[PDB]
């Protein structure tokens, strides 16, 4: 069987708990899943390569002294911008991000006409043609690849929700919590931290 | 639509992408919730401009034991609210009058209690159009357009009240105080710098 | 004029605030209510009998030590544990609890075939084929008595939600809070607690 | 998919390794495993109740006397001893077990004669008192018992093996393994050399 975990994909079946009234939700959760996938991975990798929590990473790059993020990346012996130049600038990064992500979102969602000329209908979260340089979808199964991605989508969104509530409970960070739970499983869990009071009680 | 350009839409204008419109009672609830929110956000706006007390702390000034503090709080007042010598707006006094007046108005708004007026005023209609609009602004103005204006103000003010309650929970400083801090230096005074400070808990 | 209150029962009428959802919700609210009945009664009785909150009561039986719960039951002729060996140890109780409850839930919902084969159908709101040994309510106005328990379900669920929320607010316990209210409501209240700050502000 | 594990069940399909042509060993696997499941189960139960290993539990009893078990059981309302003597329990054990064997294999007459053929490993006519044999389909339930039978025979083999390597006891080996699985296993005990090297 395909998708036998719990419930069924939006493409086929009905939610056990929700009515699934609106068909905008399907692609919404695809996009949300993909973003979460990149977010969870980011939180996984940053705290490994740098040791900082993902939720306090924002404090390193601020409109004054954004140079803290420079050279934080593993390997990458050259910093983001040279030391002493002070060019890692929150506003410069923010403007570059605003223009790039805003243009990408406008192209995806039809706020602006697509720059390309080859199909790419607005609102489809599986474009394929331009977004498969390797040609893995035509070689593989399209439907089961889409199901795998969905499983990853929902798994990563649930992992992100876990990351934020772990951040709120323990105030430490995802990987450090994972390592504490691995080291002493009985003595590092949610009920253990509840016995400590979650840091406020 | 042409008239409603906001992200969402008005009930009857169409259907919302998220949580589409169900029962009409939901639309009545939205309008009334808006109306009370407009009143609430305006009160939280004007009171601490007049005297500086955040709305989430203004409750405790009046207490069953002592309620003198609420008297003479309104700026510009010619005299005390009740005798200067012995202010008599006691919390119980306030309650006993207000529960009766508000309960009456509510039951008479919804018609669970027989209407006093019986002027053709039909309960369960957000726009009574009777004595409530003596100016009859709706009669001169265009009623569809004006309904859209009312709902836009409803949603804006309900969102503003949500902002007021969450700002109270994060910064516990006060709405206009948060405004003045942000206008003072928005770059270094906003939600994310308060997050860096930790919202007062972390 | 049965159920002449704010709302209506799932069988007749429609939900005033929330969309009625599905039949799955209609069967599920009752089960949540039965569990909330048991939970609220357990919190009430454990606190009257022991004096320590239901929430903190989870720290009494830890993997390292479960002997604290040995002599907590009021009016017990002897402690359940021998007091001297600490035989519970949280592991026997955990394992037998998970097997018994998991089996019971599996048989309730037909995850596994029912063993009685007494004609009972899985997923029924009120099976009653062997869940009414006394028969006092089976014979005579069954529909009304379902309304009775329905009203108790919604109450116990609301009471549990209030229990968890004011546990969060005050961190003292439900009936400690109830005694504080009853002794002098006017100076010991939710709004008084908010003005002083529940545990914060 | 009934029994997707490696191999096949004796009733159908030739084994993947050891060919055979005798139904006697097909009978014998299931009885050897049943005896194992009782042995391995008692391994935990005893070792957890008394806190001693099963192989020293054997020599806990002496020919001269067997009083160590008195009040050794967990939660015993009264100790089994008030004659805590080995031979007293031995003659009764060997007689009861011997009779059971004779009755199950056909050396002596069956006491019930309820149609239980000694050749049959599944005389459910008098056995399965709950009646799960007829409550559910018998074939799958044969497989379930067999799987457990093989599981517990391998667990007994491994139990006795660990007994010989570490002598610390199966569940004590379990606790040591789950405590630090990286540096507590067969290969780190072989790095110590099982005590003999
Ligand atoms: C040859 C150069 C070089 C080498 C050996 C490494 C080596 C490594 N990098 Mg680095 N990186 C290098 C260049 C760069 N890295 C990064 C940005 C990153 C990221 C984003 C990540 C790594 C990660 C890793 C690890 C895999 C490993 C420690 C990954 C890791 O696991 O971090 C611990 C990871 O997620 N590197 C950039 C972009 C500025 C580089 C540009 O030159
Ligand atoms: C001579 C009389 C008189 C004068 C000049 C003012 C003047 C003022 N009042 Mg006061 N008030 C006066 C009498 C009274 N006021 C109030 C109740 C209020 C309220 C409720 C509010 C004011 C507000 C204001 C301010 C309007 C600024 C803007 O607009 C200003 C300081 C407003 C304010 O705070 O704006 C800053 C406001 O919201 N006054 C009452 C009823 C108790 C009065 C009775 O006579
Ligand atoms: C629409 C009605 C209404 C609303 C929304 C509020 C809202 C509030 N009052 Mg006010 N009040 C209201 C009517 C009235 N109050 C008072 C008198 C008081 C007093 C005496 C006190 C409050 C307090 C509070 C706060 C309670 C916060 C809380 O419980 O934790 C948070 C709850 C949530 C987030 C809900 C979920 C909040 C700002 C208390 C306070 O904050 O004191 C500083 C307090 O002590 N109010 C009177 C009678 C004269 C009212 C009459 O209707
Ligand atoms: C008041 C009665 C009573 C209580 C509370 C216990 C309590 C216990 N016994 Mg004991 N026993 C009791 C009576 C008896 N036990 C035994 C013989 C055993 C055995 C053979 C075993 C237990 C086991 C157990 C445990 C159950 C598994 C968890 C638990 C510690 C089991 C255990 O500890 O396994 C780890 C187990 O295997 N008990 C006999 C027969 C002499 C009893 C007769 O009354
Ligand atoms: C209590 C207030 C309230 C009520 C009853 C409604 C009701 C309605 N709105 Mg309106 N709306 C509100 C507030 C409200 N809205 C606000 C504040 C905004 C601005 C963000 C809007 C913006 C809006 C748009 C843009 C649209 C609607 C639409 C609708 C209809 C869709 C069905 C629905 O969502 O109902 C259920 C009612 C809800 C309020 C949804 C629940 C929201 C959840 C619970 C999140 C809220 C979190 C909460 C504030 C947490 C507080 C915690 C704090 C106390 C600590 C219905 C008539 C749609 C419509 O009519 O389309 C034809 C539509 O297009 N509304
Ligand atoms: C005081 C609370 C209360 C009341 C009066 C009833 C009353 C009734 N229930 Mg409900 N019920 C309750 C609590 C309550 N129940 C709780 C806590 C549980 C869980 C243990 C149940 C579990 C339950 C089941 C599983 C069934 C009932 C049945 C019944 C009937 C007997 C009667 C209508 C039976 C019934 O109506 O059979 C037709 C039935 O099948 N109820
Ligand atoms: C039927 C359920 C139920 C019952 C019997 C009680 C009963 C009680 N509550 Mg609890 N409570 C409930 C639901 C309930 N509450 C819910 C749903 C909430 C969350 C909104 C709370 C939050 C709450 C707090 C924070 C506090 C109490 C307190 C109290 C006690 C005094 C009443 C009071 O001041 O607050 C009554 C408030 C409510 C009933 C909330 C009503 C909100 C809905 C939306 C209307 C009393 C024992 C207080 C206490 O003992 O300390 C002095 C206290 O500090 N309760
Ligand atoms: C995993 C545990 C398990 C399972 C699933 C079964 C399952 C079964 N047993 Mg086996 N059995 C077990 C443990 C188990 N038994 C042990 C420990 C013993 C030794 C006491 C036996 C001794 C035994 C006998 C003597 C008989 C069964 C019978 C049965 C059947 C009905 C019950 C079924 C094949 C009966 C059967 O199959 O007859 C049709 C039958 O006669 N079994
Ligand atoms: C039911 C099967 C089973 C299980 C669950 C265990 C479980 C265990 N064994 Mg045992 N063991 C088994 C079968 C089993 N063994 C068999 C069949 C043998 C003989 C080949 C052994 C011989 C053995 C030795 C000699 C030692 C263990 C040890 C251990 C522990 C360390 C982790 C581990 O498994 O590595 C062991 C895994 C294997 C030996 C592989 C199993 C045999 C393959 C399939 C052939 C753990 C409690 C060690 C210990 O005491 O840890 C504290 C230890 O020193 N085992
Ligand atoms: C990497 C990085 C580094 C920096 O340090 C900081 C940083 C923040 C920038 C960060 C960047 C992160 C990013 C870009 C993240 C993007 C995240 C996103 C899109 C998250 C979405 C999260 C979604 C959630 C929770 C869903 C909850 C919904 C649930 C359970 C309902 C489930 C439900 C339904 C629907 C149907 C069933 O039948 C029944 C049930 C009830 C089960």
Structural description of this entry:
The structure is cut from a larger assembly and holds 4 copies of chain A. Chain A is mainly α. Chain A has helices spanning 24-49, 90-109, 136-139, 142-170, 174-183, 190-196. In chain A, α1 packs across α4 (142-170). The longest helix of chain A has 29 residues, at 142-170. Chain A is globular. Chains in contact: A-B, A-C, B-C, C-D. The interface between A and C is small, with 9 and 12 residues. The structure holds chlorophyll B (4 copies), chlorophyll A (CLA) (5 copies) and the ligand CC1=C[C@H](O)CC(C)(C)[C@H]1/C=C/C(C)=C/C=C/C(C)=C/C=C/C=C(C)/C=C/C=C(\C)CCC1=C(C)C[C@H](O)CC1(C)C. One chlorophyll B binds at residues 45, 48-49, 73-76 of chain A. One chlorophyll A (CLA) binds next to α1 and α3 of chain C. It is classed as photosynthesis. The entry lists the keywords Complex, Electron transport, Photosynthesis. Cryo-EM structure of the PSI-LHCI-Lhcp supercomplex from Ostreococcus tauri. Chains A, B, C, D: Chlorophyll a-b binding protein, chloroplastic. Organism of A, B, C, D: Ostreococcus tauri.
Which characteristics define this entry?
Complex; 4 chains; binds chlorophyll B; Electron transport; photosynthesis; binds chlorophyll A; 201 residues; part of a larger assembly; binds the ligand CC1=C[C@H](O)CC(C)(C)[C@H]1/C=C/C(C)=C/C=C/C(C)=C/C=C/C=C(C)/C=C/C=C(\C)CCC1=C(C)C[C@H](O)CC1(C)C
Question: Would you spell out the secondary-structure blueprint of this structure?
Answer:
The structure is cut from a larger assembly and holds 4 copies of chain A.
Chain A: H1 24-49, H2 90-109, H3 136-139, H4 142-170, H5 174-183, H6 190-196
Helix pairs in contact in A: 1-4
